[PDB]
Amino acid sequence: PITPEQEELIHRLVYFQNEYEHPSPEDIKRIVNAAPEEENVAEERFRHITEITILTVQLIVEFSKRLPGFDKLIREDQIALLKACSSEVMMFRMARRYDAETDSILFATNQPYTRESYTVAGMGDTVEDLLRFCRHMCAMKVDNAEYALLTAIVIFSERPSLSEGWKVEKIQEIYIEALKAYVENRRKPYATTIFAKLLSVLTELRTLGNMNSETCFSLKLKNRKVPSFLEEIWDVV
Amino acid sequence: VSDICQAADRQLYQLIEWAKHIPHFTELPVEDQVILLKSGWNELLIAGFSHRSMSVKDGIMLATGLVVHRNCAHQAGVGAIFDRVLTELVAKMREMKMDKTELGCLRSIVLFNPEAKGLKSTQQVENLREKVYAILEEYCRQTYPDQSGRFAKLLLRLPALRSIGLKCLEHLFFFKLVGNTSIDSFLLSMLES
Ligand SMILES: CC(C)CC[C@@H](O)[C@](C)(O)[C@H]1CC[C@@]2(O)C3=CC(=O)[C@@H]4C[C@@H](O)[C@@H](O)C[C@]4(C)[C@H]3CC[C@]12C
Numbered sequence: 001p002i003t004p005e006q007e008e009l010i011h012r013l014v015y016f017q018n019e020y021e022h023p024s025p026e027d028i029k030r031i032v033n034a035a036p037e038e039e040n041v042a043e044e045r046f047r048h049i050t051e052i053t054i055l056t057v058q059l060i061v062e063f064s065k066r067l068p069g070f071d072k073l074i075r076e077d078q079i080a081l082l083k084a085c086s087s088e089v090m091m092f093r094m095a096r097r098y099d100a101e102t103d104s105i106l107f108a109t110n111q112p113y114t115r116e117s118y119t120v121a122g123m124g125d126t127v128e129d130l131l132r133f134c135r136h137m138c139a140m141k142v143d144n145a146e147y148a149l150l151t152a153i154v155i156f157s158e159r160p161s162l163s164e165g166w167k168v169e170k171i172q173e174i175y176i177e178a179l180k181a182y183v184e185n186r187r188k189p190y191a192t193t194i195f196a197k198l199l200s201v202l203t204e205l206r207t208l209g210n211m212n213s214e215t216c217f218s219l220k221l222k223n224r225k226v227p228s229f230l231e232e233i234w235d236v237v
Numbered sequence: 238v239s240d241i242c243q244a245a246d247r248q249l250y251q252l253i254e255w256a257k258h259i260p261h262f263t264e265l266p267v268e269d270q271v272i273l274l275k276s277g278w279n280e281l282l283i284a285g286f287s288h289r290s291m292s293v294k295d296g297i298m299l300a301t302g303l304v305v306h307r308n309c310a311h312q313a314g315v316g317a318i319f320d321r322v323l324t325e326l327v328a329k330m331r332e333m334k335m336d337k338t339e340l341g342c343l344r345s346i347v348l349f350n351p352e353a354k355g356l357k358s359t360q361q362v363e364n365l366r367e368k369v370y371a372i373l374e375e376y377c378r379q380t381y382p383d384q385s386g387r388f389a390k391l392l393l394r395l396p397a398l399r400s401i402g403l404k405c406l407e408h409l410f411f412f413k414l415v416g417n418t419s420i421d422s423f424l425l426s427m428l429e430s
Contacts, residue, residue, distance in 0.1 A: 136352075157396070160321065160324055160325060173386055176386060176389050176393075177385070177386060180385075180386075180389065192370060192371060192374040192388075193367050193370050193371060195389070196367075196370040196374070196388075196392060197367075197370075199389060199392050199393060199395075200346075200392070200395065202393065202395075202396045203395045203396040203398075203399045204352070205396065206396045206399040206400045206403065207399060207403060210400075210403045
């Protein structure tokens with residue numbers, strides 16, 4: 001057992017996680033003071049969902065760059081990793097704003113969103129899957145360190161087409177190893193079972209991220225405005 | 238019977254028979270057994286023929302011999318996944334020299350999925366998945382002691398496998414099957430045999 005200088009690594013991620021968690025109140029301002037002439041009432045729900053999400057992906061990119069090893073990669077690969085992890089990492093962010101009691105997700109505009117909120121904006125389909133994830137995560141009692149380390153393991157997931165996959169692979173091993181160190185040294189029973197359960201969450205992300213892409217296709221069919229930034233990053237056209 | 242057809246026929250027969258023999262599987266409610274298989278179906282078949290084709294060069298093997306090559310992955314029924322299977326599973330499998338014990342373990346973690354849709358005995362199925370985690374962790378530790386990351390390394394091909402699974406807009410080899418029933422009717426009757 002025993003955590004080494006992963007301890008420093010963990011403080012850093014737990015710090016930056018905290019730091020890049022909420023969008024600047026000025027940006028959240030811009031969003032509210034944007035309501036059109038008598039907003040569709042179900043639009044001041046949908047616009048919030050898609051506008052604020054631009055902020056979310058940005059914050060994700062913000063955090064991804066302060067991660068040790070990200071600079072050791074070529075721009076080509078940096079950009080690939082970023083796009084690939086965005087929708088998956090997004091789910092960890094949402095999960096952390098989940099209110100077990102009110103079964104909602106407290107947006108950065110202090111507005112609690114529920115199955116209704118999303119259904120009203122026209123996202124009733126996926127809403128349940130999202131809520132379920134939030135619930136399953138809350139049930140695991142995933143803490144900050146685990147959350148951060150986990151999101152970092154996702155960001156460094158060697159996908160095909162990356163130019164130097166072997167390098168992203170090696171960098172990720174460091175966070176994987178620090179998560180093991182951390183989980184084991186909480187010298188709690190079940191350690192291996194907890195570690196394995198944490199990692200599995202990553203498989204769940206592949207379906208959630210797929211779902212997100214699926215949701216984009218549909219908004220594109222129903223012809224509803226998907227912020228260009230999001231189309232550009234998730235390759236939604 | 239066709240060449241690829243009987244391969245598909247055997248491939249499923251082997252799957253269902255594999256699961257029938259996983260400790261405790263058949264002690265679950267039959268309906269849950271169908272659910273678990275109907276849902277784990279693609280990822281299970283994929284992981285299986287993926288590992289079995291580690292030695293095969295530029296291809297996927299299926300139910301002995303019958304090494305499908307890219308030039309007819311579409312015929313075979315692995316058209317949507319062929320490329321990624323070789324690079325994200327076959328290659329990575331070979332690279333780490335993932336053995337049969339490990340494979341079976343991961344496949345079981347896949348079969349014993351509590352988030353399976355409509356699964357009734359979720360709590361049970363979960364305890365079962367958790368045993369495999371323990372067994373597999375200890376197995377690596379005992380077998381490959383000088384590889385501190387192997388356990389997680391093996392565990393992390395599960396997402397990769399998932400992704401390849403989502404690319405299948407159907408249950409692999411199902412329409413090549415001789416009978417013409419519903420997935421559930423096929424599973425259910427194949428289970429009782
Ligand atoms: C396709 C796309 C439009 C849909 C994405 C949707 O499914 C998601 C995943 O459901 C989106 C919708 C809005 C959303 O971006 C958020 C709002 C916030 O206020 C905050 C902003 C920032 O503090 C985040 O760390 C958390 C949170 C709760 C994010 C998380 C992800 C959410 C909840």
